[PDB]
Design a protein around this nucleic acid. Structure first.
Length: 31
DNA sequence: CGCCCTGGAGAATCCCGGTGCCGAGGCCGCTCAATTGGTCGTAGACAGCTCTAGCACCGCTTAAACGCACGTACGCGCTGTCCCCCGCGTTTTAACCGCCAAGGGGATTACTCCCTAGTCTCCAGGCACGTGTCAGATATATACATCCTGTGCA
């Protein structure tokens, strides 16, 4: 049985992950 | 026959060491605008005096506010639908280094004249102010103009 999260679960942990990071989210060369 | 509650499972997180790494701060060399004093002349606070619109008020004169009665219709709650983007696995590209080394032009620092304007000065004139005059809005004679009344008639 594969292990899959229900839709909407990863969004919360992504909010927790990125809201704790001050790094820039855009690469240097494209900008 | 199919749904809350429980239990097993899995993985994401927290927290505590454990060692390599680098710039915060200290230390020095140095060096330049702050500090101290003197000079000088100048606007700001103190009256001084004045004058003028804000203040508090009183009383017509309407005019919005309000209370309510009806009402109807859209905000809302509920339900069924379906479709679209998240989660995940597989494909595809962007970027780093290795090779293999050279210059290049543009802001920086230093030097160097040179001439436009601050400062002072006097001469003039021009727009804020007072007054003339017409435009528009106002209030009133007026020549009829519509009921009312004597009034004479058939």
């Amino acid at each position: 049985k594969p292990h899959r999260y229900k839709p909407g679960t990863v969004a919360l942990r992504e909010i927790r992950r990125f809201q704790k990071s001050t790094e820039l989210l855009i690469r240097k060369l494209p900008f």
